[PDB]
Amino acid sequence: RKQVSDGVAHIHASFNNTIVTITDRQGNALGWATAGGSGFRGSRKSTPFAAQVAAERCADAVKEYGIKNLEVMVKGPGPGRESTIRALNAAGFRITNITDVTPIPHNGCRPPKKRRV
Amino acid sequence: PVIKVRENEPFDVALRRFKRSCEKAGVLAEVRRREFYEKPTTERKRAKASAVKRHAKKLARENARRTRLY
Amino acid sequence: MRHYEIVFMVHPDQSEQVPGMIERYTAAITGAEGKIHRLEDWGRRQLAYPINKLHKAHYVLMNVEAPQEVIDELETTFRFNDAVIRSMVMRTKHAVTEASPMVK
Amino acid sequence: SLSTEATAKIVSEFGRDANDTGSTEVQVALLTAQINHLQGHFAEHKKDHHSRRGLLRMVSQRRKLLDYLKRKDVARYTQLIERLGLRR
Amino acid sequence: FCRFTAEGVQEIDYKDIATLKNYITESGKIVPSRITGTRAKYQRQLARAIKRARYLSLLPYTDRHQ
RNA sequence: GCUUGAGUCUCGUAGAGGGGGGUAGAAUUCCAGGUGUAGCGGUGAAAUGCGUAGAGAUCUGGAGGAAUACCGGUGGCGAAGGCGGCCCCCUGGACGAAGACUGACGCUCAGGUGCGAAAGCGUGGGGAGCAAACAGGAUUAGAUACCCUGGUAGUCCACGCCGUAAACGAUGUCGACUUGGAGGUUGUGCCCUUGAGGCGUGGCUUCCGGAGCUAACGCGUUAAGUCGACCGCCUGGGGAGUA
Ligand SMILES: [Mg+2]
Ligand SMILES: [Mg+2]
Ligand SMILES: [Mg+2]
Ligand SMILES: [Mg+2]
Ligand SMILES: [Mg+2]
Ligand SMILES: [Mg+2]
Ligand SMILES: [Mg+2]
Ligand SMILES: [Mg+2]
Ligand SMILES: [Mg+2]
Ligand SMILES: [Mg+2]
Ligand SMILES: [Mg+2]
Ligand SMILES: [Mg+2]
Ligand SMILES: [Mg+2]
Ligand SMILES: [Mg+2]
Ligand SMILES: [Mg+2]
Ligand SMILES: [Mg+2]
Ligand SMILES: [Mg+2]
Ligand SMILES: [Mg+2]
Ligand SMILES: [Mg+2]
**Domains of chain D by start residue, with CATH:** 1-88 (1.10.287.10)
Q: A50, A80 in Cβ contact below 8 A?
A: yes
First-to-last alpha carbon distance for chain A, in angstroms, is 51
Measure the CA–CA gap between A70 and A91, rounded to whole angstroms: 11
Q: Which ranges in D1-88 belong to alpha helices (H)?
A: 4-14, 24-37, 49-72, 74-84
Nearest to A89 by CA among A51, A56, A62: A56
Tell me E24's DSSP state.
B
E39 touches strand F (CB under 7 A): yes
**Residue A30 neighbours by CB distance under 10 Å:** 17
Distance between the alpha carbon (CA) of B52 and the C1' atom of F119, Å = 33
Specify which residues E55 forms β-bridges with.
none
- Residues near A32 by beta carbon (within 8 Å), at least 6 away in sequence: A19, A20, A21, A22, A58, A61
d(CA A19, CA B51): 41
B37 vs A102: CB contact, 8 Å cut-off? Answer: no
Give the distance from residue E64's alpha carbon to the nearest chain A alpha carbon, in angstroms. Answer: 8
Q: CA A45, A49, A55, A56: dihedral to nearest 10 degrees? A: -110
Check: CB of residue C95 under 8 Å from CB of residue C37: yes
CB D82 within 8 A of CB D29: no
How distant, in Å, are the alpha carbons of A22, A114, D10, D67, D77 from that of D73?
95, 71, 21, 10, 6
- CA A22 – CA B23 distance, rounded (Å): 26
Closest by Cα among D70, D75, D54, D78 to D2 = D54
Q: How far is the CA of B45 from the C1' of F179 (A)?
A: 36
In contact, D2 and D30? CB cutoff 8 Å: yes
**What 3-state class would DSSP assign to C1?**
coil
In three-state secondary structure terms, C36 is strand
Strands A97-100 and B3-4: antiparallel
> In the A/B pair of chains, how many CB contacts fall below 8 A?
53
Give the sign of the dihedral formed by CA C14, CA C19, CA C25, CA C28: negative
Task: Select from A105, A85, A102, A83 the least CA-distant residue to A93.
Answer: A85
Q: How far is B30 from chain E (nearest CA, A)?
A: 13
One-letter amino acid for residue B4 of the chain: K
The angle formed by the CA atoms of residues B59, B63 and B68, to the nearest 5 degrees, is: 150
Burial of E10-39, coded b for 16+ CB within 10 Å and e otherwise, reads: eebbbbbeebbeebbeebbebbebeebebb
What are the DSSP calls for chain A, one per residue? ----SEEEEEEEEETTEEEEEEE-TTS-EEEEEESGGGT--TTGGGSTTTTHHHHHHHHTTSTTTT--EEEEEEES-SGGGTHHHHHHHTTTPBP-EEEE-----SS-SPP-PPP--
CB contact under 8 A, E57 and C102: no
Q: How many CA atoms lie within 13 A of D14 on its CB side?
A: 23
Contact C48 E15 (CB under 8 A): no
CB D31 within 8 Å of CB D58: yes
Tell me how far CA of residue C27 lies from CA of C63, C64, D85, in angstroms: 13, 11, 45
Q: Which nucleotide is nearest to E35 (CA to C1')?
A: F71
Please list every residue in chain A whose beta carbon sits closer than 8 Å to the beta carbon of residue E62.
104
Given a contact cutoff of 8 angstroms between Cβ atoms, the answer to whether C15 and C103 are in contact is no
Do C and B share at least 3 CB pairs under 8 Å? Answer: no
Q: Which pairs with CB-CB distance under 8 Å and at least 24 residues apart come from C93-99?
A: C93/C3, C94/C3, C95/C3, C95/C35, C95/C37, C95/C63, C95/C65, C96/C5, C96/C37, C96/C38, C96/C63, C97/C37, C97/C38, C97/C63, C98/C38
List the one residue out of A64, A65, A58, A61 whose CA is nearest residue A80. Answer: A58
Distances (CA, A) of C1 to A78, C67, C76, C90, D3: 60, 5, 20, 14, 13
Q: Which residue of B has its CA nearest to E64?
A: B2
Neighboring chains of A (3 or more beta-carbon pairs < 8 A): B, E
Q: Which residues pair with residue A11 across a beta bridge?
A: A20, A74
Experimental method: cryo-EM
Contact A48, A86 (CB under 8 A): no
B21-50 as b/e: b if 16+ CB within 10 A? bbeebebeeebeeeeeeeeeeeeeeeeeee
A3 exposed, middle or buried (CB, 10 Å; 0-12, 13-18, 19+)? Answer: exposed
Q: Are strands A97-100 and A69-75 parallel, antiparallel or unpaired?
A: parallel
Torsion angles phi and psi, residue C13, rounded to 5:
-90, -30
